[PDB]
Design a protein around this ligand. Structure first.
Ligand SMILES: NC(=O)C1=CN([C@@H]2O[C@H](COP(=O)(O)OP(=O)(O)OC[C@H]3O[C@@H](n4cnc5c(N)ncnc54)[C@H](O)[C@@H]3O)[C@@H](O)[C@H]2O)C=CC1
Ligand SMILES: Cc1cc2nc3c(=O)[nH]c(=O)nc-3n(C[C@H](O)[C@H](O)[C@H](O)COP(=O)(O)O)c2cc1C
Ligand code: SF4
Ligand code: SF4
Ligand code: SF4
Ligand code: SF4
Ligand code: SF4
Ligand code: FES
Ligand code: FES
Lengths: 439, 225, 226, 120, 156
């Protein structure tokens, strides 16, 4: 693998010894050139339109257009208080890309936030970072101090009169805090329940002000767009999803890791040519394309390009594009039990279907694991999958929770049926009362 | 001036399609047993000549009944306080045929003149303590303070003092001091009030032994007991 | 505004949500977390109806009637089979942890949860696992506390903090272990704390003064008084 | 448990009772009276009882000289055993805590988990 | 009783400077108290509420919402082993069992000498190098059941 600035805009500055790149080494490798161009020779609306026609999509997992999200901030001149939030939560099981980005290239995130805050006219920026990323917090605070001492942050940046202050908010360990409205609630110092939309955070977000929440990788894609131009970003690949994406394979493969690849790379190419295939003695059984909240796919889906549209019509989601391989030695019922235990205990507790239906699925899967399942358990799981889908719950935590359960039932129903041994018994006998024997 | 009290409620001849308004729900139980220990013969239904309500279930409490006095909210399938939805014109609005109660007077066409009697500022006189009224939701009302459940919720009797006044009198928080009003030397423990102005003693109005007419009055020989 | 509920035309206020508009029309939609005086938050997910894009639409989607504006030309169905199934499922999910408490519960016969359990048609239990349990708090001489019966509808905290501006009641914990009460044992400090016994749709917050000499609602003799 | 379901289920209205509570919180009838001069022995109260406390028994010999003596108080009703249902115990099912049965000790009940617990 | 120290209070006001609402410093105030004292005791809730100008019920709701804010006393070192899906595939169960055997305590418990407290945690964002654990501030990857006793000796 050879990494060039034109083909690997996010990872070509990565050092061989896995050490973080500081301000002098970053600026030697064309650092803050896109920030200089954006802050000196471009209007904020010009930068917003530049990102919009560059085709940059949300790297958090949903793929919403970043320029469209930036365009939805109000045009009212009296709303002069604006916030840019960097979602550095990254709590999805199977996702480790933002840790690589902020641990080794913190100035890339700082420059992307500077450009985005100038484009959004955001007077303040917050990196909502999870509490478990200690080294990312240290490196980001050091990079912020280095940029402040060199005039890249603070008051009168580049002599343009733009004031921007960047803070690092360290989290206290909940997966729901990565949800953007729940992120805003957590940033305000409240319990991280999500909020109903509309209104979207672009109109009334953090403390009622216009707010834009973006993933680490989206903001890291911003400076290369501003430095090399729109035409370079469109001609990275011939796919409907523009630019490069951090994709990887994890879990009992020969080379588990993370590589910057164009959209449209097939999952088989990542699995064999980059991850080295499965380990010796292990056979491929299934894979999840984009984290714990995505549907399982089989070996027949490995020859599919890693795009939102292609994985979407396969019955799954592209997600974070950090795929997880499941070998033949992994029981699917135990795997989905582990996933549902995570999803049920990470419920924020606001709304009934997730809060009180994910633990039911957990208990059913626990019973199926030890062969204590009863008839109607799989039908209950399927009904839970149907009734926890999009629009039924308050936020998208529970549809993501029930995606792997429904996909594993669809593809590996024989393993779920094998746990049903005992007959159905919900009652005990009461002496003196003859039961109503339903047929 | 009280002519509007006639229309506060309809008279005792008011009926909903010929029947009175029920005081108790249609599933009211124990009719032939609640008084059976006194006598196994069931007494006559209590007669209500005064109002349009009956002392029985034999009456109307329909949510669509043309009335404004609703004894309780119940609809089939709605046994909770949510039955008030069925009793309203729109949910969260008014009762369907108007809220009960009428206003005695309308807003007058002309107003009053300005009151020119501007009082002088408060001056603390030595040896005289102006009584500042302190009211309590649990304790100031007479009948409700007679309720046994209010005694635990009632604050303990006290007298509020400024820190400067308490330091001048040489008392701390909790020390029992005595004062005489209308020849009644009564003793209360002192608590310190930061926001009370000096020259005033804070007294809990309406409590036992402290009448609400003591508000705005003055106190003599208020000293440590 | 003009809405069509189950093929029947109705004239409503467009500034209202669909739940309060349909309840004002006499239609029955089960609900927990909405209150007329507290607004809509869309927590309990009980008030699901099926909204269609137009008249010639048979698929539709499940929406929250309390979170959906009753705008002009709005086509919804309450008696849709999927909507009824989802509402019954929401009641069933609430029933999984609910204690077997109605005979010894002061809310019985006056309980919104009982009414909505009957209204959705849910009477058969297929859940067979354990029920979560909570310890109670002492809330003073007026309000009795029983957190086992909580359905996590958030009505109490919304009323007490957002409406009555009280400070000593809150929600604690997360997922299915959310707890509603004071941070420690003590008397509820708000002068309007007693409205919790009508705001709470279950028997968590109950009238202790009534609980001493308890009787059911059907056994009461009521009068309108001042 | 003085739940008053039998009294409201009675079509004659010949059951009257009042709830009282012990110090540990156990509900019980302070009094319980049945007007047997009114009772039609229909069994709807036993059907409505959720604790199997009230039971119609195979005993018909109930004639009386004075009608006032047909009002049976609690001392004339409460017997020394379980009657027709030998093993049912409502308080083993209820979530309400009483003496000898704390929170989490009823059937199909998990132990209470404090919100301050370290487990996620 | 509880009294906030001068350093804790100064750090709390310094964090209050970073936002337009002092309520936004609640999580970091709880983290400051936890960093100083290992956990957040009961009087710290009222102290942080008094400094921040928000009700104590809100501070307790925040503290009991977030799993990494400890409202019960913990050991001198908090072991947090990942129990998520990739570490399940990579075999976190052997690591957990090795921790059970070495520490003689269940997850969520604290050892008898107060040295260690064992906790499951969600995915640590290190799934390619799993299975993973997090002792107090250090993350350990590529875990094997044989290396667990050697890992536990360097935390006195
Ligand atoms: N660690 C991670 O990165 C995790 C990522 N995810 C991903 O999160 C995604 C779900 O997140 P959501 O925020 O619910 O997705 P979404 O589709 O609702 O929206 C994503 C973004 O687009 C914006 N947006 C969408 N429609 C909009 C509109 N009409 N107007 C204005 N803004 C609009 C939202 O504000 C948000 O910033 C999934 O794809 C899942 O893979 C989930 C869990 C963890
Ligand atoms: C339950 C849940 C958790 C989420 N966690 C994260 C997260 O940890 N990091 C992240 O960037 N996005 C997360 N998201 C997606 C965000 O809601 C949001 O789409 C994203 O952070 C910002 O949008 P962007 O991808 O356009 O940058 C989560 C979504 C949900 C529903
Ligand atoms: S689905 Fe509901 S309970 Fe679950 S995390 Fe989202 S809002 Fe909270
Ligand atoms: S809250 Fe309602 S449903 Fe629950 S035990 Fe009490 S009466 Fe029964
Ligand atoms: S205590 Fe009552 S009002 Fe509060 S959330 Fe629970 S059920 Fe709703
Ligand atoms: S058997 Fe007697 S007491 Fe029981 S419901 Fe029938 S009439 Fe009433
Ligand atoms: S006898 Fe049964 S139905 Fe009657 S009050 Fe007692 S427990 Fe309830
Ligand atoms: S009443 Fe609409 S979701 Fe609760
Ligand atoms: S699954 Fe364990 S570190 Fe991600």
């Amino acid at each position: 693998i050879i990494r060039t600035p034109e083909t690997h805009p996010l990872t070509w500055r990565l050092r061989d010894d896995k050490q973080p790149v500081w301000l002098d080494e970053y600026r030697s490798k064309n650092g803050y050139e896109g920030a200089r161009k954006a802050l000196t020779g471009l209007s904020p609306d010009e930068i917003v339109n530049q990102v919009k026609d560059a085709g940059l999509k949300g790297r958090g997992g949903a793929g919403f257009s970043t320029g469209l999200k930036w365009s939805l901030m109000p045009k009212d001149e009296s709303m002069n208080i604006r916030y840019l939030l960097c979602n550095a939560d990254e709590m999805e099981p199977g996702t480790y890309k933002d840790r690589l980005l902020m641990e080794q290239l913190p100035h890339l995130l700082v420059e992307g936030m500077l450009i985005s805050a100038f484009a959004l006219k955001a007077y303040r920026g917050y990196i909502f970072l999870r509490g478990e990323y200690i080294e990312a917090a240290v490196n980001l605070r050091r990079a912020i101090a280095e940029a402040t001492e060199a005039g890249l942050l603070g008051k009168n940046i580049m002599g343009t009169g733009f004031d921007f202050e960047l803070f690092v908010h360290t989290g206290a360990g909940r997966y729901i805090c990565g949800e953007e409205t729940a992120l805003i609630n957590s940033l305000e110092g409240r319990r991280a329940n999500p909020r109903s939309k509309p209104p979207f955070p672009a109109t009334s977000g953090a403390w009622g002000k216009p707010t834009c929440v973006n993933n680490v990788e989206t903001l890291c894609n911003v400076p290369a767009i501003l430095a090399n131009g729109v035409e370079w970003y469109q001609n990275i690949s011939k796919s409907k999803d523009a630019g490069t994406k951090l994709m990887g394979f994890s879990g009992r493969v020969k080379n588990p890791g993370l590589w910057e690849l164009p959209f449209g790379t097939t999952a088989r190419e990542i699995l064999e040519d980059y991850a080295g295939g499965m380990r010796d003695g292990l056979k491929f059984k299934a894979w999840q394309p984009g984290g714990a909240g995505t549907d399982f796919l089989t070996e027949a889906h490995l020859d599919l390009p890693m795009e939102f549209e292609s994985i979407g019509k396969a019955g799954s989601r592209l997600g974070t594009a950090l795929a997880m391989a499941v070998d033949h030695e992994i029981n699917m019922v135990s795997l989905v039990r582990n996933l549902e235990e995570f999803f049920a205990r990470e419920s924020c507790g606001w709304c009934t279907p997730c809060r009180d239906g994910l633990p039911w699925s957990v208990k059913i899967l626990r019973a199926l694991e030890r062969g204590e399942g009863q008839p109607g358990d799989i039908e209950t799981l399927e009904q839970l999958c149907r009734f926890l889908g999009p629009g039924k719950t308050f936020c998208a935590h529970a549809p993501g929770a029930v995606e792997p359960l429904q996909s594993a039932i669809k593809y590996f129903r024989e393993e779920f049926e094998a746990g049903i041994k005992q007959p159905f018994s919900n009652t005990h006998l009461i002496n003196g009362i003859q039961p109503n024997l339903l047929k | 001036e009280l002519a509007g009290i006639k229309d506060a409620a309809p008279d005792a001849t008011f009926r909903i399609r010929g029947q009175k308004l029920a005081r108790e729900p249609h599933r009211y139980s124990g009719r032939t047993a609640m008084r059976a220990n006194i006598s196994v013969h069931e007494p006559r239904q209590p007669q209500d000549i005064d109002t349009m309500f009956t002392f029985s279930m034999e009456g109307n409490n329909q949510p669509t009944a043309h009335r404004s006095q609703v004894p309780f909210a119940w609809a089939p399938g709605w046994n909770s306080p949510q039955a008030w939805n069925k009793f309203q014109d729109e949910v969260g609005g008014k009762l369907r045929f108007g809220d009960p109660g009428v206003r005695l007077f309308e807003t007058s066409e002309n107003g009053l003149d300005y009151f020119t009697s501007v009082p002088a500022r408060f001056q603390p006189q030595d040896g005289k303590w102006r009584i500042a009224p302190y009211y309590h939701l649990f304790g100031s009302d007479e009948l409700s303070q007679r309720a046994p459940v209010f005694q635990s919720r009632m604050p303990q009797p006290y007298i509020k003092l400024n820190p400067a006044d308490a330091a001048k009198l040489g008392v701390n928080a909790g020390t029992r001091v005595s004062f005489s009003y209308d020849g009644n030397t009564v003793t209360l423990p002192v608590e310190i009030a930061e926001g009370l102005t000096a020259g005033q003693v804070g007294l809990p109005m309406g409590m036992s032994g402290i009448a609400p007419v003591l508000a705005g009055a003055h106190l003599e020989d208020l000293k440590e007991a | 505004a003009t809405i069509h509920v189950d093929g029947k035309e109705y004239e409503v206020n467009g500034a209202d949500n669909l739940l309060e508009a349909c309840l004002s029309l006499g239609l029955d939609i089960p609900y927990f977390c909405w209150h007329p005086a507290l607004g809509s938050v869309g927590a309990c997910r009980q008030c699901a109806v099926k909204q269609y894009q137009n008249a010639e639409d048979t698929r539709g989607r499940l929406v929250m009637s309390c979170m959906t504006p009753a705008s002009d030309g709005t086509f919804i169905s309450i008696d849709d089979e999927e909507a009824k199934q989802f509402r019954e499922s929401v009641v069933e999910w609430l029933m999984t942890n609910h204690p077997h408490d109605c005979p010894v519960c002061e809310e019985g016969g006056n309980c919104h949860l009982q009414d909505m359990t009957v209204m959705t048609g849910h009477s058969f239990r297929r859940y067979r696992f354990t029920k979560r349990t909570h310890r109670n708090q002492d809330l003073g001489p007026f309000i009795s506390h029983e957190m086992n019966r909580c359905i996590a509808c958030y009505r109490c905290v919304r009323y007490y903090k957002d409406y009555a501006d009280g400070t000593d009641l809150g929600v604690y914990g997360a997922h299915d272990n959310v707890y509603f009460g004071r941070p420690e044992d003590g008397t509820l400090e708000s002068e309007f704390s007693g409205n919790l016994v009508e705001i709470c749709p279950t028997g968590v917050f109950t009238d202790k003064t009534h609980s001493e000499r308890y009787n059911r609602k059907w056994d009461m003799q009521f009068a309108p008084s001042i | 448990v003085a739940c008053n379901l039998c009294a409201v289920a009675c079509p004659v209205g010949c059951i009257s009772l009042q709830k009282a509570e012990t110090k540990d919180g156990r509900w019980y009838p302070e009094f319980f009276r049945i007007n047997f001069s009114r009772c039609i022995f229909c069994g709807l109260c036993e059907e409505a009882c959720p604790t199997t406390a009230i039971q119609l028994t195979p005993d018909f010999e109930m004639g009386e000289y004075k009608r006032q003596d047909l009002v049976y108080e609690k001392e004339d009703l409460l017997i020394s055993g379980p009657g027709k249902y030998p093993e049912y115990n409502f308080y083993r099912m209820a979530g309400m805590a009483i003496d000898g049965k704390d929170k989490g000790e009823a059937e199909n009940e998990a132990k209470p988990i404090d919100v301050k617990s370290l487990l996620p | 009783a509880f009294e906030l120290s001068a350093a804790e209070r100064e750090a709390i006001e310094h964090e209050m400077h970073h936002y337009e609402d002092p309520r936004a410093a609640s999580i970091e105030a709880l983290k400051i108290v936890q960093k100083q004292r290992g956990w957040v005791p009961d009087g710290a809730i009222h102290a942080i509420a008094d400094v921040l100008g928000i009700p104590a019920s809100d501070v307790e709701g925040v503290a009991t919402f977030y799993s990494q804010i400890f409202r019960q006393p913990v050991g001198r070192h908090v072991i947090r082993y990942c129990d998520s899906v990739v570490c399940h595939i990579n075999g976190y169960q052997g690591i957990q069992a090795a921790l059970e055997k070495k520490l003689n305590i269940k997850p969520g418990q604290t050892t008898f000498d107060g040295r260690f407290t064992l906790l499951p945690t969600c995915c640590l964002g290190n799934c390619d190098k799993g299975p993973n654990m997090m002792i107090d501030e250090d993350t350990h990857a590529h875990l094997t059941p044989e290396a667990i006793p050697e890992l536990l000796e360097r935390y006195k």
